[PDB]
Structure formats: structure tokens, C-alpha cells
Amino acid sequence: RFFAICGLQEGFEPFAINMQRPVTTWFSKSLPQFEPVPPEHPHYEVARM
Amino acid sequence: KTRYALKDTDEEVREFLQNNLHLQGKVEGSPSLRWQMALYRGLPGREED
């Protein structure tokens, strides 16, 4: 709705100008899941004894 | 713009463009010009004349 007004003449292109399928999007799902404790976690450390 | 960098007057660039009218881009050879030309030709006041 406003690409021609501001953005077309400045040399900018639409993010998906030449694409067949719509751009796949990822969303932050608020469903808790169990994941491995990162080796570089700032607060939690796991030692294998 | 290159001719202006070489310190040419407004008459020199015009005659340079007159002899170089065939160097304008071709829509078939560029994917970017495909949608730009289609968007350009959609304006109400665009006449091919």
C-alpha cells in the first residue's frame, strides 16, 4: 500500500518479490519442552561424575 | 553520470545519450526489470507516446 510512495524510488525491493510459494514463517510456541542444558548456560552447570 | 564525472556540459551529455539510445536495458534480460516495468506501466498517466 505504500511501497510506491516510499521505497520504490529509493531502490528497495519487496522481501519476496520473486517467489512462488509464500514465505514460510516460524512462531514462538509457548508450549514448555524439555531440552538439553546448554554447556555455556550462565547459571546452570551439569557435571558428569 | 560518468560523462558528468568527466566535466561535460548539458549539451555534451544529451548528444552522448542520443548516440547511445540502444544501451537501455532489456526487460527480458533482467528479472528485476520484469516487475519494475509492470509496476511502472500501471500508472494512470503513462502513455507509450
List the grid coordinates of B31: 528479472
In whole angstroms, what is the distance from residue B19 CA to residue B14 CA?
9
DSSP B2-31: HHHHT---HHHHHHHHHHTGGGSPPTTT-S
How is residue A17 written as a grid cell?
518479490
Chain A: closest CA distance from residue B14 (Å): 23
Q: What is the resolution of this structure in A?
A: 2.5
| B4 interfacial to chain A (CB closer than 8 Å) | no
**Apex CA B33: angle with CA B49 and CA B27, to 5°?**
65
Contact A18 B39 (CB under 8 A): no
Interface test with B, best of A3, A5, A18 (most B CBs within 10 A): A18
Experimental method: cryo-EM
* C-beta separation of B33 from B39 below 8 A: no
